[PDB]
């Protein structure tokens, strides 16, 4: 047994199948902030931190002089919730309408707190994120919505002359997301022309973000490290419900400020 | 070329060969921290802390729980020396009376303080040492040096009440070394009798030491973490001197604290 | 499973292996009356006294007569302990610094009541120890340590005349072991002669006992029968801690009572 005690929770291996695959799916749909940055292979448990590849000179005396390596640790994230028992029974005897709400939340709840960290940081846990490490000022958006194309050409535009270069994703909330969709110009969508402006990029639809940006796919420029990943995990039962959890160990970190522009 | 940028100093390969010979040499005789506590492999230079492997909880916000791995950053030290040209031209010219006094002053620099973070701590690097880092009271040493092997004694039986066991090993600086090994009780050794109670153990020589300590060598209780190992590198040079520094980066960590007891 | 229920302890299987290392480690280095006494393998659990070999005569009507076999039932211990669990999720995470004090503390009753019933015997479970089934009168020893070895002989030769024979071996407490261990008569070690009194035996360290005494080594004078052996098992755990336990059935007899002397 791993630090997951899940063969001491009262579930069934279907119900586990499909536990495990609702919250999967609901992630990797809700998630738009994993698609905007490089995310490697999980590194373990083990490791802790992230060295920053720099020193800081605190002091030093006589011939001896001494400095201190620079390292940014990791956070781990924790997201309990209640399933059913009566759910769980019903899983072999043959239930496929079982709406798992309270795993479809918590998955929620931890897509909002990594794409927070990942677009404006987490400020608790030392994360900076895109939106606030950008050298670059705010390019504004204009208004009605049929002019978003002269906001989207000023920030490519700021990041090409910033030498950063490559395919841009223009990351949006989910209103903005709706109202670009729907507006029309001259009866020809807008979005064609943002695609075109992005150089081959994509328009992605962010539920958790809170501000519209773009960025470079070029590659290197951001990185999300885990340690671990996206887990369920068993804490306890009673003889109604089964409480569970969804942990992930994680940091981000910015490498290039220039590569990410904020369009508030 | 590394970091150490040796094939820029205006020193002859048969130069390079004496000047990083005798500093080993000092070093290898000279350290004896090294030898009570476990070493293994150099990391690299990529590597800047270690994982504590605990967690500390900071703060939890509905649903979500937030807790941040716990590290210690490693610590370099660099200390510099000038070194002869006349001296550096005369190795190979055929010069054996050379004596590498500014090496040697160097890596007893670094001994010193390699062995004070060892056994002490250096409370500057976040390094606690075997004597701080004790559980176990100070044990008396009787005056007179004939019986010093009460307080051999006491410390291994306090060790082995401990449950440590294993051969010990106890450390004494240069003078009490001195003092030991020309006392001679009844015409007897007391060295013999020490090495008896000292399970098969050996007495060292520890010119950098501060205090007298009795570790375990049973293994595992304490580890000296090297990104980087003792290396020579170049700075600068005018026409009379050649300007060089000894570098090490490196941590030390105590797992088990009552592995060892201070004897003073 | 088995009764030792172990799967179901919201315990991983690296702290499974460190929590039953360090139980086995602290057994084996602070249990000292396993060393003078002779221990077969164990039986089994089904396993429940050991027979005798005598018969009381009860009564005996006309020509019927009845006569019991006389047995020793086993007796089996447990002692309870309480562990922390997040101790044992950072098993995983990578701690080696865990110092598991309440299973040292467990270990330590353990072997103690162990020692207590082979030595001087339980008398609650019907076992009667070397010191009280010995014939021989106690050997009275001198003060100030340094004559220790008159006791020893009068001990050595009380069970020579015994016509017992073997290696002998010194079992003390660690008190008497600390101050023998330093007392050095005119500068030559008493433990030499000692040793050389002994026949090529061994002074033993025994935290756990309560009086000195000499044992033979030759086998086949007492015997500690092991049904089960010491074993770690699950009871119960809270969202706080995990409870376990450290089980042993056995039984201790003395066939022999000559071949032991009490030096008291």
Redesign the interface.
Same mark, same amino acid.
């Given at each position: 047994?791993?630090?997951l005690?899940r063969?001491?929770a009262p579930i069934s291996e279907a119900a586990w199948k499909q536990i495990d695959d609702e919250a999967r799916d609901t992630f990797s749909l809700r998630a738009a902030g994993r698609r905007v940055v490089d995310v490697p292979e999980p590194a373990g448990? &083990?490791? %802790?931190?992230v060295?920053? %590849?720099h020193?800081e000179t605190?002091?030093q005396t006589? %011939?001896?002089? &001494?400095?201190?390596? +620079?390292?940014q640790?990791?956070?781990?994230? +924790?997201?309990?919730?209640t399933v059913s028992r009566a759910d769980i029974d019903d899983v072999e005897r043959g239930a496929v309408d079982l709406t798992w709400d309270p795993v479809d939340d918590?998955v929620a709840?931890?897509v909002d &707190?990594e794409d927070t960290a990942i677009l404006h940081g987490w400020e608790?846990?030392g994360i900076t994120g895109l939106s606030e490490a950008s050298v670059h000022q705010p390019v504004q958006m204009p208004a009605e919505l049929e002019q978003i194309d002269d906001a989207v050409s000023g920030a490519c535009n700021v990041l090409r002359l910033a030498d950063v270069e490559g395919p841009y994703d223009l990351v949006l909330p989910q209103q903005l997301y709706t109202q670009v969709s729907e507006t029309t110009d001259h009866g020809v969508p807008v979005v064609d022309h943002l695609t075109q402006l992005l150089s081959g990029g994509e328009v992605l639809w962010a539920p958790a973000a809170r501000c519209a940006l773009v960025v470079s796919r070029r590659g290197g420029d951001s990185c999300l490290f885990l340690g671990r990943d996206v887990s369920i995990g068993y804490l306890?039962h009673d003889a109604q419900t089964v409480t569970l959890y969804l942990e992930e160990?994680f940091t981000f970190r910015v490498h290039q400020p220039d590569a990410a522009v904020a369009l508030v």
């Open positions: 047994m791993n630090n005690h063969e001491l448990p &083990t490791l %802790g931190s060295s920053l %590849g020193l605190g002091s006589d %011939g001896v002089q &001494t400095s201190v390596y +620079r390292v640790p990791l956070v781990q994230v +924790r997201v309990p919730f918590a709840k931890l &707190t608790e846990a306890s160990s």
